[PDB]
Nucleic acid binder design. Structure first.
Length: 297
RNA sequence: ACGAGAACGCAGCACCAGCUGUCCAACCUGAAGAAGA
């Protein structure tokens, strides 16, 4: 709809649980936390939170794009029911991201499992080796897991019905970085809003299968109906609260288990902005709203 | 309210020690300060 294309000119560190590892993408709660921190910095966190909770701004999580090829995580479809020939989900196991336009080819088979993998070539991971220099003690080494994007490669976020506030926070987020060691030399990108009409065709279409495009958690009143002919994967979201005015000490937020952003559902749900920090001075939010791409299955 | 915050891959270390740019080889060979009539 309004694809936020991210062009990174520095290696990124998106940690899953450890500083020594990096993942190639970042989630929607990570982007929401970054934008909320920017809004706190410029003093309208409440306006941004109301925009996000009232669905004025709702965004997927970051996906790879490689030379105007927008990719989507391989959806967890209840297919492979073709029980005669081929290799459904056999060679479709090392394939992590499928092109968003080639999704109909993947649905009915014919997508080349091998060719879709060497075609998918975005940068490469690295380990940065560092120390804390101590003038008289022994210097303690530590290392940071990083990912470097390629020349015509980056990440993109699906935003529908963009907002002036979202564009203003995205401009400020350029000069603060995104990811782990952004105050060191790791969070650095340029962004475009780049309205697209090919992608709008996919998201204006209806279907019997809803591909979840962001880490989402249905509310308790709808989790039961969401779990009906669903093919999902449950992911833990947590970590330490990143703020200056919370608890006067480093404290981990509550662990939130959400549906991973490749899950497919037949019943649509709209998640929630969950408060995973309640004992501190300010609320801590975990964006778990549902972004859906509908297909025919 | 970004599995995140803070953290120099940093400190000491001579590209250095020994070793003739040396050995062999005639500036040499031949030539009337001399003759008209």
């Amino acid at each position: 709809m309004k694809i936020i294309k991210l062009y990174f000119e520095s290696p990124v560190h998106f940690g899953e649980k450890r500083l020594s590892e990096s993942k190639i993408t970042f989630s929607a709660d990570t982007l929401f936390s970054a934008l909320m921190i920017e809004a706190v910095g410029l003093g309208k966190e409440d306006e941004f939170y109301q925009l996000a909770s009232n669905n004025l701004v709702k965004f997927s999580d970051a996906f790879p794009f490689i030379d105007q090829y927008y990719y989507i995580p391989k959806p967890m479809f209840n297919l492979k029911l073709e029980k005669e020939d081929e290799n459904p989900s056999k060679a479709f196991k090392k394939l992590l991201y499928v092109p968003i336009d080639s999704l109909e080819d993947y649905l009915s088979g014919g997508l080349d499992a091998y060719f879709e993998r060497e075609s998918f070539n975005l940068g490469k991971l690295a380990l940065s080796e560092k120390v804390q220099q101590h003038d008289f003690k022994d210097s303690e080494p530590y290392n940071v897991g990083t990912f470097t994007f390629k020349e015509n490669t980056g990440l993109y976020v699906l935003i529908e019905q963009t907002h002036p506030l979202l564009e203003e926070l995205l401009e400020n987020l350029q000069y603060s970085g995104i990811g782990g060691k952004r105050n060191s030399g790791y969070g650095k990108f340029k962004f475009e809003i780049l309205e697209d009409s090919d992608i709008e065709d996919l998201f204006s279409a209806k279907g019997n299968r809803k591909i979840l495009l962001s880490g989402a958690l249905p509310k308790d009143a709808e989790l039961e109906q969401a779990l009906k002919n669903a093919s999902y994967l449950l992911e833990r979201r947590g970590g330490f609260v990143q703020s200056d005015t919370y608890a006067t000490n480093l404290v981990k937020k509550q662990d939130l288990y959400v549906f991973k952003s490749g899950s497919t559902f037949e019943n649509s749900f709209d998640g929630d902005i969950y408060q995973v920090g309640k004992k501190g001075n300010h609320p801590v939010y975990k964006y778990a709203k549902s972004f859906f791409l509908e297909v025919s299955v």
